[PDB]
Amino acid sequence: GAMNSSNYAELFNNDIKLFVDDTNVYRVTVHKTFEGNVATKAINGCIFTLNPKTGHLFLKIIHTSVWAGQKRLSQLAKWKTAEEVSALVRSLPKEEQPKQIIVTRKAMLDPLEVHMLDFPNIAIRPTELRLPFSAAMSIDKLSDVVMKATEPQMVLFNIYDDWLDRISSYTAFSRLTLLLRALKTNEESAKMILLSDPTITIKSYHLWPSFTDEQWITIESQMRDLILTEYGRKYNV
């Protein structure tokens, strides 16, 4: 059934599972036409498929050509997501295939179930968690590879960098969701926090800066403050 606060530790057990987020698959800019009507222009998108235990991110880049000549793109985008996740699963060795796939939006359940009929033993699950994976395109290196793509492409990342050398998966996921929640609530402030000290850099093979353990505590405290603040600025409290 649905994943929630009650069965949260299930994410970090030894059953392979993947989160799938489709928020950033179909992306548009809305603009005025010369006649003063409105129109959309698609830009490149991505499926965000993540193993929460290991950090392995399967970033399938959705090039704008996939929408050419198609109708009802927001509906199509869910089915295209499901097509690509099913293709990913089939591409993995049997012992790497997930036992569960958790979709972050319930509208993905039927598309994914239908595409995975060949895999009756893989459970497709919703979640009651409000996960901030839409903010993935606020990670500069992820945004850059998506925007630069000229064709469909799959790019592999570890979204935890080397954190698992020092912390548990549970703690690594907690840090990731905190960073992403901050980036979603106030992207500019969030990114300022992450880079304000230019002596801390992002390794070429990493996504986030090379913080010490103590520096991550300071960082994480600044992100919470940001989130609570914004929560005030928003509701006035």
Binding site: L76, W79, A82, E83, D110, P111, E113, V114, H115, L117, D118
Partner: protein, 300 residues
């Protein structure tokens, strides 16, 4: 006009014949039902006064044999049987008819309701859904589960309706996942009609039989099957014009006949709203939509 004679009525019971019903008291001198129209299947059904649990009954066609009803005090129900001795049967019925101990099938001459509800229903197809080959008639009750319900437990007592499942490999061609799920025409026309049912008459016959079992016995799996067969047509963009017109007539008479007070349990809000207002065929069921809106506007 054929006759189903009754040995006796030892227990108080409400007896149904098709859409008609009458109350029989304990040990009342009731000896059967005469003037049953030839040319149709029929159903004779029972609800005991002391246990309104288990509605049950028998689907039969008088052209296939001489059938009679007798109460079994061991199994505690009215049973249908076949009498092979045609002389014994004429003698039992003529005696009963002379003493006026039979109710008459009370068909109004103008009234095409039963024909309209059983237009495509055939005894030979009932006997394949309800498997008991040594008898020519078919027993159904409130509690019997369907093959599909069993998959999700006695197979001998099951309703072998055709399994319909919208999220199944049977329904979804590899490579056409979104297309086939959103437009079920290939599942309807190639898999079910051409492949399994062979023609639309057999499909409609199973649909009509499922409705009648839902209505007369409150059989839940039959109601599921009726709604699934409706939904598969309405969810197909490409349906022969003659099937849509016939479906509209079929459903109209089903909705017309349904007891006003059972709509809450026998009609699935999601399916009907989808079929009448969202589906490809939302504009193809004018008679059904009109009677639904005037009779059950709450459900919608």
């Amino acid at each position: 006009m054929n006759t189903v004679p009754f040995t006796s009525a030892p227990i108080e019971v409400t007896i149904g014949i098709d859409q008609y019903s009458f109350n029989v008291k304990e040990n009342q001198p009731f000896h059967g039902i005469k003037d049953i129209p030839i040319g149709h299947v029929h159903v004779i059904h029972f609800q005991h006064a002391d246990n309104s649990s288990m509605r049950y009954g028998y689907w039969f066609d008088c052209r296939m044999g001489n059938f009679y009803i007798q109460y079994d005090p061991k199994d505690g129900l009215y049973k249908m049987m076949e009498e092979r001795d045609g002389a014994k049967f004429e003698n039992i019925v003529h005696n009963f008819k002379e003493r006026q101990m039979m109710v008459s099938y009370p068909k109004i001459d103008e009234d095409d309701t039963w024909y309209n509800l059983t237009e495509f229903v055939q005894m030979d197809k009932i006997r394949k859904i309800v498997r008991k080959d040594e008898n020519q008639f078919s027993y159904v009750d409130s509690s019997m589960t369907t093959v599909q319900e069993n998959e999700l437990s006695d197979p001998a007592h099951s309703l072998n309706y055709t399994v319909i499942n919208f999220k199944s490999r049977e329904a979804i061609r590899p490579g056409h996942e979104m297309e086939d799920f959103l437009d079920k025409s290939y599942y309807l026309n190639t898999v079910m009609l051409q492949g399994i049912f062979k023609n639309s008459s057999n499909y409609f016959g199973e649909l009509q039989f499922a409705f009648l079992n839902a209505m007369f016995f409150g059989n839940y799996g039959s109601s599921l099957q009726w709604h699934a067969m409706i939904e598969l047509i309405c969810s197909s963009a490409t349906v022969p014009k003659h099937m849509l017109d016939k479906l509209d007539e079929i459903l109209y008479y089903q909705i017309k006949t349904l007891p006003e007070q059972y709509s809450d349990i026998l009609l699935n809000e999601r399916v009907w709203n989808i079929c009448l207002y969202s589906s490809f065929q939302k504009n193809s069921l004018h008679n059904t939509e009109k009677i639904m809106e005037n009779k059950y506007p709450e459900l919608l």
